[PDB]
CSV table of N, CA and C in Angstrom, one decimal:
chain,number,residue,atom,x,y,z
A,1,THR,N,31.9,-70.1,107.8
A,1,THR,CA,31.1,-69.2,107.0
A,1,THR,C,33.1,-68.4,107.7
A,2,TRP,N,33.5,-68.0,106.8
A,2,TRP,CA,34.7,-67.2,107.5
A,2,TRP,C,35.2,-65.8,108.0
A,3,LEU,N,36.1,-65.0,108.2
A,3,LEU,CA,35.7,-64.4,109.6
A,3,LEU,C,37.0,-63.4,110.2
A,4,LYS,N,38.0,-64.3,110.1
A,4,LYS,CA,39.0,-63.9,109.9
A,4,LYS,C,39.2,-63.3,111.3
A,5,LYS,N,39.9,-63.5,112.6
A,5,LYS,CA,40.2,-62.6,113.8
A,5,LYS,C,41.0,-63.1,114.5
A,6,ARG,N,41.0,-65.0,114.6
A,6,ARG,CA,42.0,-65.5,115.8
A,6,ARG,C,42.9,-66.5,114.8
A,7,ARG,N,43.5,-66.9,114.2
A,7,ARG,CA,43.8,-68.1,113.6
A,7,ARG,C,43.0,-68.4,112.2
A,8,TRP,N,41.4,-67.9,112.0
A,8,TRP,CA,41.0,-67.7,111.3
A,8,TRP,C,41.3,-67.1,109.8
A,9,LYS,N,41.4,-67.3,108.6
A,9,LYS,CA,42.2,-66.7,107.6
A,9,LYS,C,40.5,-66.9,106.9
A,10,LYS,N,40.8,-66.6,105.1
A,10,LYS,CA,39.9,-66.9,104.5
A,10,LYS,C,38.9,-67.7,104.6
A,11,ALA,N,37.8,-67.5,103.6
A,11,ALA,CA,36.5,-68.7,103.5
A,11,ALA,C,37.0,-69.9,104.5
A,12,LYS,N,36.8,-70.8,105.1
A,12,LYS,CA,37.3,-71.7,105.9
A,12,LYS,C,36.0,-72.3,105.9
A,13,UNK,N,34.8,-73.0,105.9
A,13,UNK,CA,34.5,-74.1,106.7
A,13,UNK,C,32.6,-73.1,106.3
A,14,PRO,N,32.1,-73.1,107.7
A,14,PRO,CA,31.4,-73.0,108.2
A,14,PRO,C,30.3,-71.2,108.2
């Protein structure tokens, strides 16, 4: 499940 907060970006896996 996306989130984007720390290193996270667009939709990425869980």
